[PDB]
Amino acid sequence: KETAAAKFERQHMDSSTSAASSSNYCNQMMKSRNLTKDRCKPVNTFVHESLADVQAVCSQKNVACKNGQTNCYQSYSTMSITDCRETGSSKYPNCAYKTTQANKHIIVACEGNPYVPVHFDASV
């Protein structure tokens, strides 16, 4: 099964472009990233920054998540993003989206495991 981290890259990362190049960006990207495979995902954001810069947000500003959890982080700087929002005519399998370009701070939930001892090697 696809990992949680890979699924985030698939749904949100587009470091290959600096911004949405046209009004059909979302229609194309929601389809090519499989976000319209079985249903039309309603709202989705793509981030036009390097994978290193997006992963770095996990060590930036800790803020509360929408659901009340405490593992969300907000980027210190704004980032180039594209908001994809379904239009009213959107009807699976013919999903349809409005593309909006923005420069905003992103807020993402991060997961990992702390760097801790896992084996005892020797003493000296």
Q: What is the DSSP string of the chain?
A: ---HHHHHHHHHB-TT-SS--STTHHHHHHHHTTTTSSS--SEEEEE-S-HHHHHHGGGSEEE--TTS-S-EEE-SS-EEEEEEEE-TT-BTTB--EEEEEEEE--EEE---------------
Resolution (A): 1.7
Q: Is 117 annotated as a binding residue?
A: no
51: closest CA among 16, 25, 84? Answer: 16
- Which pairing describes strands 61-63 and 72-74: parallel, antiparallel, or unpaired? antiparallel
CA dist 54 and 75 (Å) reads 8
Question: What was the structure determination method?
Answer: X-ray
CA neighbours closer than 13 Å in the CB half-sphere of residue 78 = 7
- CATH code: domain of residue 30: 3.10.130.10
> Which contacts qualify for 14-22: CB closer than 8 Å, 24 or more apart?
14/46, 14/47, 14/48, 14/82, 15/47, 15/48, 15/49, 15/50, 15/51, 15/54, 17/48, 18/48, 18/80, 19/48, 19/80, 19/82, 19/101, 20/46, 20/82, 20/99, 20/100, 20/101, 22/99
Question: Is 100 flagged in the annotation as binding?
Answer: no
Domain with 8, as residue range(s), is: 1-124
Residue 99's closest CA among 29, 10, 14?
Answer: 29
Provide the number of structural domains found in the chain.
1
Catalytic (active-site) positions: 12, 119
Does 70 appear as a known binding residue?
A: no
